[PDB]
């Protein structure tokens, strides 16, 4: 047979780790994205881009080390090592923050190579591609938060850094500046993820608890072989449970397991639609008539207007040290503040 | 002070999709009743 | 002209009504007040 056919045999050779055609894209890019995150969090600074310390070498724990976004001085540049702002010179490419784009552009093709891997396994193993469909959610969250969100904002500075505390403030960045919990696209996302952990806890519990006696051991885990033709939990008994406890229960295993596919996945889509809202700053920030009536009645307070005062706490206090390049100098009489604290 | 066509956009955004999905249910119940010949045709 | 060898029945269960209504009514609880402002 041909040359390409022999190449096709040898990467599709069944061994301990399957390589595949997608593995020509996955295994270089997924190694470097995971490798560049480890080197950037152990050695490389934020000191010239954010003015922070973010590395295990400088003082950070696991919780505060981060591969950090470049400066706003660089715009949306790709920060190529050979590029016009690095010009080779790996030392200068790290201090400008080139590793963050290095991780984010190899994490992008690593996720492409991992979804393509789920198509390639599913063909040759001969099975329906619903893992590749269910993985398209985590692609959408990555692309919309780490790529589509900065590319509508001022530069790459506003995507979150790859680190534990550095994401934690991106939670509190989008709260203060963007009122991110109020976006109903995000509320559908929370319902999908909490409802997804709900279904993982339910279907785990009911299967373990409608099990059949298949042995005399008090341990029940050893009474299963994978080649069985029968069911190991009573679906009739499990339907009689929830229909009589909750009122409403499943009656298909096919509709159940699609529903466990569906709920976490469509949480991540509807949430990732709304983060393309803030990329271009179209956001559910205020209700108008709710905010009218407050400005004509000083009597009228809601929890909603309580949140706006907390939002201008985050907006005003953080921004002097949030964006250091824009050189916010805030007088202490300017800074909004309650009584005594 | 409250916005204006939202009284339209909610109630026509409820009822027109709600009444649509009713009728894919009314369609089958008639189709399953036309299948098994009973007192209804 | 002619009858098709394509045309088929379209179905929706009783539960799929209840999913489908409760989809529309609960999205109308969410996206109501944002439209009202």
């Amino acid at each position: 047979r041909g040359l390409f056919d022999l190449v096709d045999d040898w990467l599709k050779k069944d061994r301990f780790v399957f390589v595949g055609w997608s593995g020509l894209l996955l295994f270089p890019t997924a190694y470097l994205a995971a490798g560049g995150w480890m080197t950037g969090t152990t050695f490389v600074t934020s000191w010239y881009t954010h003015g922070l310390a973010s590395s295990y070498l400088e003082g950070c724990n696991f919780l505060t080390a981060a591969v950090s976004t470049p400066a706003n001085s660089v715009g949306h540049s790709l920060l190529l090592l050979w590029g016009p702002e690095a010009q080779g010179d790996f030392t200068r490419w790290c201090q400008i923050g080139g590793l963050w784009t290095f991780v984010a552009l190899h994490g992008a093709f690593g996720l492409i190579g991992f979804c393509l891997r789920q198509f390639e396994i599913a063909r040759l193993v001969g099975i329906r591609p619903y893992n590749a469909i269910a993985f398209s959610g985590p692609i959408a969250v990555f692309v919309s938060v780490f790529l589509l969100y900065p590319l509508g904002q001022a530069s790459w500075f506003f995507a979150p850094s790859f680190g534990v505390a550095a994401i934690f403030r991106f939670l509190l960045f989008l709260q203060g500046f963007h009122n991110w919990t109020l976006n109903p696209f995000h509320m559908m996302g929370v319902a999908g993820i909490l409802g997804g952990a709900l279904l993982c806890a339910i279907h785990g519990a009911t299967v373990e608890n409608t099990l059949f006696e298949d042995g005399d051991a008090a341990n029940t885990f050893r009474a299963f072989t994978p080649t069985q033709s029968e069911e190991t939990y009573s679906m009739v008994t499990a339907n009689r449970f929830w229909s009589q406890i909750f009122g409403v229960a499943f009656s298909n295993k096919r509709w159940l397991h699609f529903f466990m596919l569906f709920v976490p996945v469509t949480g991540l889509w509807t949430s990732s639609i709304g983060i393309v809202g803030l990329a271009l700053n179209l956001r559910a920030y205020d209700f108008v008539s709710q905010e009218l009536r407050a400005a004509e009645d000083p009597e009228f307070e809601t929890f909603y207007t309580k949140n706006h005062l907390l939002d201008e706490g985050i907006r005003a206090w953080m921004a002097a040290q949030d964006q250091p390049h824009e050189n916010f100098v805030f007088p202490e009489e300017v800074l909004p503040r309650g009584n005594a604290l | 002070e409250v916005q204006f066509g939202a009284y339209l956009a909610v109630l026509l955004g409820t009822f027109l999709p709600a009444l649509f999905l009713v009728n894919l249910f009314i369609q089958t119940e008639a189709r399953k009743a036309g299948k098994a010949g009973g007192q209804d045709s | 002209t002619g009858p098709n060898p394509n045309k088929q029945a379209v179905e929706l269960n009783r539960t799929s009504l209840y999913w489908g209504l409760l989809l529309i009514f609960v999205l109308a609880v969410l996206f109501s007040s944002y439209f009202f402002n």
Binding site: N239, V248 | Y7 | N13, Y18, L21, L22, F25, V29
Partner: peptide, 30 residues
Amino acid sequence: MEALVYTFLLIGTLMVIFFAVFFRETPRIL
């Protein structure tokens, strides 16, 4: 007048849940 629309939809969901529990399509063993 939008508190009408709010309570119509909240009671609207509460009605749909009532029909979904007590008027459900029962599953049969057959």
